Design a protein around this nucleic acid. Structure first.
Ligand code: IHP
Lengths: 133, 375, 216, 141
RNA sequence: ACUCUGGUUUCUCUUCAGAUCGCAUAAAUCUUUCGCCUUUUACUAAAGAUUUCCGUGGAGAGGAACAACUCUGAGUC
RNA sequence: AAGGUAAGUAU
């Protein structure tokens, strides 16, 4: 039932009446504690800050180099979306919901005719030339 | 053994360049300065037994974290079920390979600490202590069998055997007996220390993951990126705040356009706006370029010898068929426009040679199918 | 003699009043702020432009007239459109949509036009098979580029002396050219086998890689 | 382009799965921005038109609805749980976790066959059902 | 022979790495090939590019501890 | 490490 508000005060896991899909142990997780977690996170950040700056700079340089070779998907049509708004309101409103250079074949026809004429002329020398009726 | 260990040494010597321009952030010193820990002085054996108890507590919580009593880890760091575990219970009580590695390394450190403990508490003399240290350092593969826990560790243990191979060889070089009396554990001890130093980042990362609360796509990725980007651009241009339904129908034309490119059939929609048609043309040209590129790339991968799946092979075959059909189309069109390539009087000369050869053969040409035939 | 004879023979000069127009992502307020900051102000480039580089239009994704092959022949005025069409170019590969506003001031006596049919797509480099459709006769692009320069460029009737067209697939491809002796006007193909070929024989039908013309 | 219905709220997905009758509710857990999950969503969109009579697909976001992440151990991308007839079915396809399909199907027809087999098993009343195609091997060779 | 000259142990803190950072040597991910191949944990074994990881140096800063003993060069000596 | 939980039924 998409588009409906969720009545609060009820636990979705318990109200539905489901059973814990214990696939495998050690695969799921299953204030003083908050202060300790903050302290340990600060220690982890301090440990990680040993190489953060140089790694970030190198990653930024590599990403910038990669962008020049091939930009994002929307970059190839940034001009198009810039000019996309130029379409009138009545244009997309009536969108259907349902789903010089002469005849270049003339040269080929002339070549084929010349070849056929030459072959017909050469057919005279064919003493044993035969046909059907 | 000497040749293999020389190979290991030369491979170590080849790749040796540190980029590590660190900020000298002493994480250990920061942990020491943390209020959650304190400093003191104690004997090394006391620290060893403390670490053994801490590791047992670690494995105890890691095992009975989900209140599961199926698997029990003994004080000797050997896991053992409390009964004949049920198959469903066996699936419930399962741990990863890195947990196997952690249990093995805890077993190794615990056994080393206990060996020093029994040495200190009289028992066996120090010469045999050194000999047992040497053996354990050079027989962890046999003692713990890290093979399954980690394939790479096999390299360490095998080279440890190689170093021991040399150690015993020299120790028992002369008057010294050819028995097990060899005491040069440092040579394998340093190798195990180095391998443990390499391993410990993985164990720390996984232990942090547990301690926290959060314990074929490339072509599909690019296709999804193309379609999502074009849809987002349309929804930016098309005022979703006013018109809602038709935008979804817009996607239909997308697919239509795409198949209109695949079938190589004309595609003209006068109802659609001209800028919309231009955007569709850009989308379809990009999609066709990418599609042909990946088609020929996957065809090259298949023909080279790379292993491919049945659905992938069928899709690549379909794409190749479409591409070849298109290519034959413009080839036939180019032949029609440029005319036959048989040079003037050249095909005539070939025909004259053929008819002269036939006249030399002097055979009766095949006539029309007669009313009466032999068979 | 800094001006080399080879360079000065085909030097040229384009007074491209290049404008650093705001990026498309910039809204109307940002565009107005940039205009007040003279971001989109036209700045003369004074580009050397030794050889003109005229790019063919977009290739036909879907063939409408003849499904087998659609050839969108580009009129020769597209090259002559550089007076205003290039002056109306507001496109760049960078984040900011640079307005080129190209304007060729001084046209060199030798005009070397490069079609640049080959272009790299997101995956592979492809060539537009659009026909050249460039007649070999007098031209007036120099007058269009600068009306006052017609007095300086009295001999605006430039004939395409030598046209070279690529052929075959982009990977395994070759080239063939046709050149006309100055004065004599033989207009013969330079290919060793086809030494004498005066008539165009749909010369403009193929994707001419480059053309060279003399002001005369 | 991920136009399938999505559960904005976690409890909404719960009542949507509860509000089922003679139909299979394929709840695809994950994130749309993931590339493999994008491929899975595209496959589900392709299937949706053909089997909309009995198969309804209703995507959800783990970040939007994290309460169900720990319920069925949702810690992988592309996860699919055929929560049909208010009963989590046991779909066995030669894998260790026979209640979760956590990778995009190579072909649409295979997914259609799987979902119709799931529908047949659910209608029969059995809580477990096997797959005609085992996925213990990827048939790489 | 005369005047100024002025510490080294340390503890941490913040930077930069030149220098075989280290006269030792691991591991992880990604990438191309090789044995591949039965799906991932994985591998085999080399190359390529990162990252973590044990450590270190330079340089600077702040307290403690020998800060009063000067070391020492300069000061025509 | 694994790729080896039958489901059903009320307690
Ligand atoms: O199994 P291998 O690697 O081939 O070596 C073992 C063994 O080694 P482990 O103790 O590592 O099992 C002995 O070596 P030490 O007892 O000396 O340590 C033994 O050697 P000794 O006979 O010298 O005791 C003997 O080697 P060998 O009989 O060749 O000397 C034997 O090798 P084999 O299994 O080839 O007999």
């Amino acid at each position: 039932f998409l588009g409906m508000p969720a009545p609060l005060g009820y636990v979705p896991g318990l109200g539905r009446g489901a059973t814990g899909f214990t696939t495998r142990s050690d695969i799921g997780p299953a204030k003083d504690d908050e202060e300790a977690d903050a302290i340990y996170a600060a220690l982890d950040k301090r440990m990680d800050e040993r190489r953060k700056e140089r790694r970030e700079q190198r990653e930024k340089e590599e990403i910038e180099k990669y962008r020049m070779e091939r930009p994002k998907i929307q970059q190839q049509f940034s001009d198009l979306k810039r000019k996309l708004a130029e379409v009138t309101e009545e244009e997309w409103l009536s969108i259907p919901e349902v789903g010089g250079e002469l005849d270049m074949r003339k040269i080929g026809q002339a070549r084929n005719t010349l070849m056929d004429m030459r072959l017909s002329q050469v057919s005279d020398s064919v003493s044993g030339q035969t046909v059907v009726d | 053994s000497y040749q293999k260990l020389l190979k290991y040494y030369v491979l170590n010597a080849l790749k040796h360049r540190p980029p590590k321009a660190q900020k000298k952030r002493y994480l250990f010193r920061s942990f020491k300065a943390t209020k959650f820990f304190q400093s003191t002085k104690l004997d090394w054996v006391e620290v060893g037994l403390q670490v053994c108890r801490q590791g047992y507590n670690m494995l105890n919580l890691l095992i009975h974290r989900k209140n599961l009593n199926y698997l029990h880890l003994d004080y000797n760091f050997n896991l053992k079920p409390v009964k004949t575990l049920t198959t469903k219970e066996r699936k419930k009580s399962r741990f990863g390979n890195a947990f196997h590695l952690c249990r093995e390394v805890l077993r190794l450190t615990k056994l080393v600490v206990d060996s020093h403990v029994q040495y200190r508490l009289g028992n066996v003399d120090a010469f045999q202590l050194a000999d047992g240290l040497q053996y354990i350092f050079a027989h962890v593969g046999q003692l713990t069998g890290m093979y399954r826990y980690k394939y790479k560790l096999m390299r360490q243990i095998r080279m440890c055997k190689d170093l021991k191979h040399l150690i015993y060889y020299r120790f028992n070089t002369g008057p010294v007996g050819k028995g097990p009396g060899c005491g040069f554990w440092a040579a394998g001890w340093r190798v195990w220390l180095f391998f443990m130093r390499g391993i410990t980042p993985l164990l720390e990362r996984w232990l942090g993951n547990l301690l926290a609360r959060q314990f074929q796509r490339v072509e599909s990725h690019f296709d999804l990126e193309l379609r999502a980007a074009v849809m987002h651009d349309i929804l930016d241009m098309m005022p979703e705040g006013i018109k809602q339904n038709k935008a979804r129908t817009i996607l239909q034309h997308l697919s239509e356009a795409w198949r209109c490119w695949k079938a190589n059939i004309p595609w003209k929609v006068p109802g659609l706006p001209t800028p919309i048609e231009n955007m569709i043309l850009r989308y379809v040209k990009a999609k066709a370029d990418w599609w042909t590129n990946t088609a020929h790339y996957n065809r090259e991968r298949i023909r080279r010898g790379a292993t491919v799946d049945k659905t992938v092979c069928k899709k690549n075959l379909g794409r190749l068929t479409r591409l070849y059909l298109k290519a034959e189309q413009e080839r036939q069109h180019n032949y029609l426009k440029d005319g036959p390539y048989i040079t003037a009087e050249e095909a005539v000369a070939v025909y004259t040679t053929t008819v002269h050869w036939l006249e030399s053969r002097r055979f009766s040409p095949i006539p029309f199918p007669p009313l009466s035939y032999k068979h | 003699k800094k001006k080399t004879i080879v360079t000065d023979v085909f030097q040229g000069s384009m007074r491209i009043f290049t404008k650093k127009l705001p990026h498309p992502d910039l809204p109307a307020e940002e565009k107005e702020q940039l205009l007040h900051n003279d971001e989109y102000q036209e700045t003369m480039v004074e580009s050397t432009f030794m050889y003109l580089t005229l790019d063919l239009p977009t290739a036909p994704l879907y063939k409408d007239e003849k499904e087998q092959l659609i050839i969108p022949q580009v009129p020769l005025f597209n090259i002559l459109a550089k007076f205003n069409g290039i002056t109306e170019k507001e496109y760049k590969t960078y984040k900011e949509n640079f307005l080129k506003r190209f304007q060729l001031t001084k046209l060199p006596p030798y005009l070397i036009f490069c079609i640049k049919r080959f272009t790299k797509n997101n995956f592979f480099v492809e060539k537009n098979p659009t026909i050249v459709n460039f007649p070999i006769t007098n031209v007036d692009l120099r007058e269009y580029l600068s009306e006052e320069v017609q007095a300086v460029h009295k001999n605006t009737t430039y004939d395409l002396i030598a046209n070279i067209v690529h052929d075959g697939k982009p990977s395994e491809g070759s080239y063939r050219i046709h050149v006309l002796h100055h004065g004599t006007g033989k207009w013969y193909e330079l290919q060793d086998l086809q030494v004498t070929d005066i008539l165009p024989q749909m010369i403009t039908l193929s994707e001419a890689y480059i053309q060279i013309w003399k002001r005369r | 382009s991920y136009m399938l219905p999505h559960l904005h709220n976690g409890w909404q997905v719960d009542q949507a799965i509860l509000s089922e009758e003679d139909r299979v509710v394929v709840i695809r857990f994950g994130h749309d921005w993931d590339p493999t999950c994008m491929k899975m969503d595209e496959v589900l969109y392709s299937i949706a038109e053909k089997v909309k009579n009995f198969a309804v697909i209703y995507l959800v976001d783990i970040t939007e609805v994290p309460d169900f992440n720990k319920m069925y151990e949702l810690y992988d991308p592309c996860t699919v749980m055929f929560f049909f007839r208010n009963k989590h079915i046991m779909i066995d396809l030669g894998t260790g976790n026979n209640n979760k399909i956590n990778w995009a199907m190579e072909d649409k027809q295979e997914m259609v066959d799987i979902i119709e087999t799931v529908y047949r098993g659910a209608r029969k009343g059995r809580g477990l059902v096997v797959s005609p195609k085992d996925y213990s091997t990827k048939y790489r060779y």
